[PDB]
Amino acid sequence: QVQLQQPGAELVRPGASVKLSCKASGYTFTSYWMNWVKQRPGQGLECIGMIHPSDGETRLNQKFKDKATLTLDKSSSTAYMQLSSPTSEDSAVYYCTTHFDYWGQGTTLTVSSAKTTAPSVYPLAPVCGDSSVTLGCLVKGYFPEPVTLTWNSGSLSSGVHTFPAVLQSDLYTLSSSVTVTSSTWPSQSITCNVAHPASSTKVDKKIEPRG
Amino acid sequence: DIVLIQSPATLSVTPGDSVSLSCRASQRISNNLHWYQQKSHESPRLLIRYTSQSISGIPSRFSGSGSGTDFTLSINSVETEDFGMYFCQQSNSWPFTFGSGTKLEMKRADAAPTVSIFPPSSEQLTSGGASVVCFLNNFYPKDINVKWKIDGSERQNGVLNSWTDQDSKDSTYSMSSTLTLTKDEYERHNSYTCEATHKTSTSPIVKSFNR
């Protein structure tokens, strides 16, 4: 079967070049154009360019003429797209697709100067002296994605909103809310648990009423 | 470059409804117009090529029409699996360009947000940073304006906002907004307010505390 295999994620320091790969299988590699598409999440799609593996004929979008370089390693049926001098505007998902019918899963490229960094995890109790109660957990200053956040080790799963992480000045912030009846908390305990595989950390923070 | 204009931005439907999505081109592109569907966390999927030629296996409720500068995607009776983003793309001239997308979402009753404000935790306040968190939960429709006020005056920089996808079970949206200051600055103001304006009311929902 036709497959276009892309890594899920790449991390790059600003100013350091990165090469993304798209490994093709299950068809004649030299019979179809290979296209690269950029998408900033929640935003639209942009054609970066295309290369035909027959002879390496390349068409670039002028917008990327100083940013993107398309190459191949035909012996391994792989197409590459190299980004020069990356900046935070280059953080995006990048797809390879042949004729816009078969698509790779996309590579999430993140540009940051950060090292692997465990999050600071903060319990959020309601305003001091303030039928339902909403508690929160703030997950700040980490790198890279992802984290796994749970409440009461997963046994508290309803009434939860865990928000997508947002990268800002090299680090991610995420938050989660949980809503329970006022007879549930604080009479029963509620704790936010946060695992960050890249740092091998798992942290618990009990939500306590403010004094 | 050829510009593609899509409308509307958002279409809110009940399963069974019929819809029409518009794509208009800045110049004649003949029949060289394609439609894509993109679901959350997925790559785009080619739906219709060359204006009206439906892709093998795409359900027959989908059809495309138009020519020259004016194109339409029709969905006969929307199923829940049809919710997501729809993009048109022209391949008349290089660089191939995409429209800004139409989001097809589930219609439900208008709902005001449940708003909750959280002062910085004492844990964070042992650090040099201070974040105030506001959760705006379970509202509909998605359009919402959130302001942070510090001693009555609006502050926009150092704000980090994150939005959930439409909830698959109740069709609402939620948003988290985080205002971060240095601890030193935080301790030099008293009043912190999160203000939400949503179509469900003429007056904003205001949540506030004094430090």
Binding site: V2, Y27, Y32, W33, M50, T98, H99, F100, D101, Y102 | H34, L46, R49, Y50, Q53, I55, S56, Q89, S91
Partner: peptide, 10 residues
């Protein structure tokens, strides 16, 4: 010259 969809559909 590229035909959109021609890889999967000729």
């Amino acid at each position: 010259p590229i035909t959109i969809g021609s890889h999967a559909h000729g």
